Amino acid sequence: SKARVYADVNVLRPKEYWDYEALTVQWGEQDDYEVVRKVGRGKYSEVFEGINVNNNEKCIIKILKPVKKKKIKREIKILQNLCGGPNIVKLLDIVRDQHSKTPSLIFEYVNNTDFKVLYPTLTDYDIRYYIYELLKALDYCHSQGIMHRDVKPHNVMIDHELRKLRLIDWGLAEFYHPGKEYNVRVASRYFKGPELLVDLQDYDYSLDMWSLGCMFAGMIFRKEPFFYGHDNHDQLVKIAKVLGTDGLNVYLNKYRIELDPQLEALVGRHSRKPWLKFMNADNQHLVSPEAIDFLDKLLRYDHQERLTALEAMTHPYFQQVRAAENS
């Protein structure tokens, strides 16, 4: 399988662009940056609000848990390559504790609002607007030959006050090379595309569009998460109970994948469930025919059939947002 767009980005660019293993990190001064308070944490890092002692400006400090040097070089190089793109978090500095040699990445400060309280208050238009802004970031990174691979609400920072959005945590992102086989143990469970759940390793930028779709479905249906699987196998079953088993089997035979017997049995047979059946009194104000049409072009088994981020931004569902932007 190859990507339908931006397939040759890394083929055209110099090896220095994408050979992250050969990067040479110019370490800054650890003292320039002081931690003020913890604002987050995950499996690979702790995140703090900090201060730049010289300009006394706020910043974000991400202290990395121990991992192989390669993964560290990957995140940095990707951040450096994307620096300046729309709605991509900006890496400001890189520093290491002399003794421990524990790295910290320093980023511009963003005043994020917790999605668990933000989302149920967004109005129809707000959704349109933030999903458009997230699309700009995704089209930009794909255009630069990179896949994010962990798109989820937690990785989308929003400052509802200022209307500002940033795509963060590029720790799982990789460079796309035509025909390369990637690890399928990426993304977070609820946002994993079928390709990952069926061991299709030669995936591409379209993976991020599946994840974006899941996010979107979650916001317009107020059903977070939308596909609530317990383990990887159950995740596939949860998708199949909605999209239906016929499309899955068409997909598997097209890419010549055999599902493992246990899994096959878990999946079973299921008819497709119309998106309208998830409509209810709490979400109704969010669910236009254009919302459903867009969602439908995102959540497809076949990664090759999904809308690309560029196409997505021109869908009529966004036209007011576009108009607003054109001043």
UniProtKB/Swiss-Prot annotation:
GO terms for molecular function: ATP binding; protein serine kinase activity; protein serine/threonine kinase activity. This is Casein kinase II subunit alpha. Casein kinases are operationally defined by their preferential utilization of acidic proteins such as caseins as substrates. The alpha chain contains the catalytic site. Keywords: ATP-binding, Kinase, Nucleotide-binding, Serine/threonine-protein kinase, Transferase. ATP binds at V39, G40, R41, G42, K43, Y44, S45, E46, V47, K62. The keyword Nucleotide-binding applies. Residues 33-318 form the Protein kinase domain. Pfam families: Pkinase (PF00069). The active site is at D150. It catalyses: L-seryl-[protein] + ATP = O-phospho-L-seryl-[protein] + ADP + H(+); L-threonyl-[protein] + ATP = O-phospho-L-threonyl-[protein] + ADP + H(+). Belongs to the protein kinase superfamily. Ser/Thr protein kinase family. CK2 subfamily. The keyword ATP-binding applies. The lineage of its organism: Eukaryota, Viridiplantae, Streptophyta, Embryophyta, Tracheophyta. It comes from Zea mays (Maize). Tetramer of two alpha and two beta chains (possible). Its EC number is 2.7.11.1. InterPro entries: CK2_alpha, Kinase-like_dom_sf, Prot_kinase_dom, Protein_kinase_ATP_BS, Ser/Thr_kinase_AS. GO terms for biological process: DNA damage response; regulation of cell cycle. Transmembrane segments: none annotated.
